[PDB]
Design an enzyme around this catalytic site. Sequence first.
Site, PDB file in Angstrom:
ATOM      1  CG  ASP A  39      -7.688  -6.309   1.554  1.00  0.00           C
ATOM      2  OD1 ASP A  39      -7.365  -5.818   0.691  1.00  0.00           O
ATOM      3  OD2 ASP A  39      -6.738  -7.084   2.323  1.00  0.00           O
ATOM      4  CG  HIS A  49      -4.577  -6.374  -1.593  1.00  0.00           C
ATOM      5  ND1 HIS A  49      -5.093  -6.471  -0.234  1.00  0.00           N
ATOM      6  CD2 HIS A  49      -3.350  -6.554  -1.677  1.00  0.00           C
ATOM      7  CE1 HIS A  49      -4.050  -6.776   0.464  1.00  0.00           C
ATOM      8  NE2 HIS A  49      -3.009  -6.626  -0.443  1.00  0.00           N
ATOM      9  CB  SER A 103      -1.112  -8.721   1.745  1.00  0.00           C
ATOM     10  OG  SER A 103      -1.031  -7.261   1.878  1.00  0.00           O
TER      11      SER A 103
END
Length: 269
Positions: free
Chosen positions: A32, A62, A215
Amino acid sequence: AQSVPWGISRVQAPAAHNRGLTGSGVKVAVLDTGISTHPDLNIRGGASFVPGEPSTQDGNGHGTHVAGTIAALNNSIGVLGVAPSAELYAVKVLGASGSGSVSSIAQGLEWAGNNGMHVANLSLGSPSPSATLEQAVNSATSRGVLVVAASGNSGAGSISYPARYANAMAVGATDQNNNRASFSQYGAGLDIVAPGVNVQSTYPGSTYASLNGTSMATPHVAGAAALVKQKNPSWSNVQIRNHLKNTATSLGSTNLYGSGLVNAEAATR
Ligand SMILES: [Ca+2]
Ligand code: NA
């Protein structure tokens, strides 16, 4: 005070924790934007494959959020992961903008395989096929990694890459009514779904944030895989994947939902 995000309860992770299953000893790579240090996370290691971004710290948020869904610590603060004792590895393959390259993702997969990861969480996707991505997924799988990937957020009836490849376990998103989230990609190759609307998790700056997306669904499944691996240390990637599907709560058509909603309690009975 610790809060249990609704999706963590929805996948019945607390029941698994009550059995004594936490993901202890299971190595989970988060491919990520990085993972930032946070009071509610423990990061064991990692590596960066983003040019000019040498550290594994998260310049986006994120990756830190995804990591907290997997493994936020079970304590008196913050949130709670599906697998709060999992060994997290920050594998930076996306830059601070939130995007990366096939090159970088592939290198992160190769690193996961060569470093003995049990699970690799890929909350990421590309619209187009990529033979390099396919081969990196297949190689990691061969080495023993369970690759778990997001289906994508376009709302289309085909899923993103690398989720679309057979050796990546493809995860779509559900909402609080146990319906498919409107944005959640579906179709051929979808394996399973998990909560992906209004998901609170860890964020850089020692804070928390709520996000929507496939996600956010993906790490619930990665964490559930870690619980299954702790219970069944001899099991392969494939055995874990199949068991998660076989113990999911069916939600309807496999086109829309795959096997349905992951269930960490059922998966660890
Ligand atoms: Ca916590
Ligand atoms: Na797949």
